[PDB]
């Protein structure tokens, strides 16, 4: 027997900046968003789900300097919490 499934579900996109806007990349240190995301994943994957982690990344960008950007989550169809459970 056949059954119906949603065509688009369990997605989350995380972009480095908001529409219309630049994202920054240090020539030797790398992309700030990428670096920031790695740091937050390393720290918070053990205790927080991905949506919570991405929110923390966004908070870390809150105070704008000369090179400002605000990461954004888009097209979210996660129906559950995604915990990475590192080590397991």
């Amino acid at each position: 027997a056949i059954k119906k499934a949603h065509i688009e579900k369990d997605f989350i996109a995380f972009c480095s900046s908001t529409p219309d806007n630049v994202s920054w990349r240090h020539p030797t240190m790398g992309s700030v968003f990428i670096g920031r995301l790695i740091e937050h994943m390393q720290e918070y994957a053990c205790s927080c789900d991905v949506e919570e982690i991405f929110r923390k990344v966004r908070f870390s960008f809150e105070q704008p300097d000369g090179r400002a950007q605000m990461p954004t989550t888009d097209r979210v169809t996660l129906t559950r919490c995604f915990y990475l459970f590192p080590g397991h």
């Binding site: 790398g30 790695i38 400002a68």
Partner: protein, 168 residues
């Protein structure tokens, strides 16, 4: 210790695991075949060289491996090649015995989307986010039905500084 497979990723203890109905199920560590893909464009025909991209590749690759994913790294592709790579990724048999996936895109970008290696103002070479979702949805990638698909994009989305002034 950072000498283990999880590197610098802080470990979730068994006490924390039991503390954490509304969570995505994780497959057995012994048998699961988690897959991840990184597409990074550093060398371009018309737009400047993305110096430091190698740092991003290293960091993301090691992080996703630390989290238990086998990472494919593809570099310097046109939008058409990205499409071909995505379609090939979506067809991978390992997804069947996987519980999730990560997709990472790193390039120059405009409002419309992500720049391929051959992009210019006269002849645009753009991959839209919409296309990435379509290639990975239930229709085109049934092996990832009910499984988290995390898409990460490092790119500009326009030319604006993203700021406005205010006085306190």
């Amino acid at each position: 210790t950072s000498s283990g497979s999880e590197g610098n990723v802080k470990l979730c203890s068994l006490e924390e695991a039991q503390r954490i109905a509304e969570i995505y199920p994780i497959m057995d560590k012994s048998s699961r075949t988690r897959l991840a893909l990184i597409i990074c464009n550093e060398e371009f025909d018309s737009i400047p060289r993305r110096t430091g991209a190698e740092v991003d590749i290293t960091g993301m690759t090691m992080l996703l491996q630390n989290l238990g994913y086998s990472v494919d790294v593809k570099k310097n592709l046109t939008a058409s090649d990205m499409t071909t790579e995505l379609e090939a990724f979506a067809h991978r048999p390992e997804h069947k015995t996987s519980d999730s996936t990560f997709l990472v895109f790193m390039s120059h970008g405009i409002r419309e989307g992500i720049c391929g290696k051959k992009h210019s103002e006269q002849v645009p070479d753009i991959l839209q986010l919409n296309a990435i979702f379509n290639m990975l949805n239930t229709k085109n990638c049934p092996s990832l039905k009910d499984k988290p698909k995390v898409i990460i994009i490092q790119a500009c989305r326009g030319d604006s500084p993203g700021v406005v002034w205010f006085k306190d």
